Design a protein around this ligand. Structure first.
Ligand SMILES: *[C@@H]1O[C@H](CO)[C@@H](O)[C@H](O)[C@H]1NC(C)=O
Lengths: 99, 49, 50, 49
């Protein structure tokens, strides 16, 4: 619930250097293909970020039910955007329970 | 003079010829022959085609 | 080896199949059946059934 | 051999780095793709270059 809304506007975005960052398997988008963002352009980008479990990533799809889809940030059914997720037992996995 | 009787013959020939020629279209599938889809793919995907 | 699961090396082997009217130089293992004519039969010539 | 993020780009009708500049499949491609991990043999602590 502490997902910082980093509203992004008025900047040229290079979408090719995102693969050098943290290792997501695929640039998992819903509605746009992740090579046509360099010429098709949008009106307002909002950046959100949260840490969830392994069997909770499927609720960050447009149209789903569960626990994150009901009690946390639920993506809308008509969601035009991209969701980037990866496994994180390297940095934010401090032992004895990361509360 | 017999153009209307000739047209009565020709329309029924042409509609049947179009109906036979329509068997070769793919309609979005991968093959227009049914036996190739039966002997080429698994159950669900060949059911889709 | 200290990278994530998305940065691991991967070995990709792809097979490309030719599906043309050319003669079948290579294909698969069926025992051949003798030829009979002038009879309603269920033939199978070079992989296509009928 | 490729990385883990470029396995999905080895497909017909795909664009990117490998799928635009190095290795491309035709739009009517039929055939099989086999991919497996090679962390045991292709990875070294000093770095495989
Ligand atoms: C992101 O920042 C952290 C700490 O500042 C660093 O360890 C990590 O290497 C950075 N990511 C990349 C892809 O360099």
């Amino acid at each position: 619930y502490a997902w910082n809304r980093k509203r992004i506007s008025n900047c040229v975005a290079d979408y090719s250097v995102i693969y050098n960052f943290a290792p997501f398997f695929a640039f998992k988008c819903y509605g746009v293909s992740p090579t046509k963002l360099n010429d098709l352009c949008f009106t307002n980008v909002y950046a959100d970020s949260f840490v969830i479990r392994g069997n909770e990533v499927s609720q960050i799809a447009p149209g789903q039910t569960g626990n994150i889809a009901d009690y946390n940030y639920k993506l809308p059914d008509d969601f035009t955007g991209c969701v980037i997720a990866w496994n994180s037992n390297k940095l934010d996995s401090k032992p004895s329970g990361n509360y | 003079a017999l153009g209307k009787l000739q047209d009565v013959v020709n329309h029924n020939a042409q509609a049947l010829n179009t109906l036979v020629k329509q068997l070769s279209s793919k309609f979005g599938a991968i093959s227009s022959v049914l036996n190739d889809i039966l002997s080429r793919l698994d159950k669900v995907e060949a059911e889709v085609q | 080896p200290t990278y994530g699961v998305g940065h691991q090396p991967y070995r990709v082997v792809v097979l490309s199949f030719e599906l043309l009217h050319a003669p079948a130089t290579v294909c698969g293992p069926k025992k051949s059946t003798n030829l009979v004519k002038n009879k309603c039969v269920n033939f199978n010539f070079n992989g296509l059934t009928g």
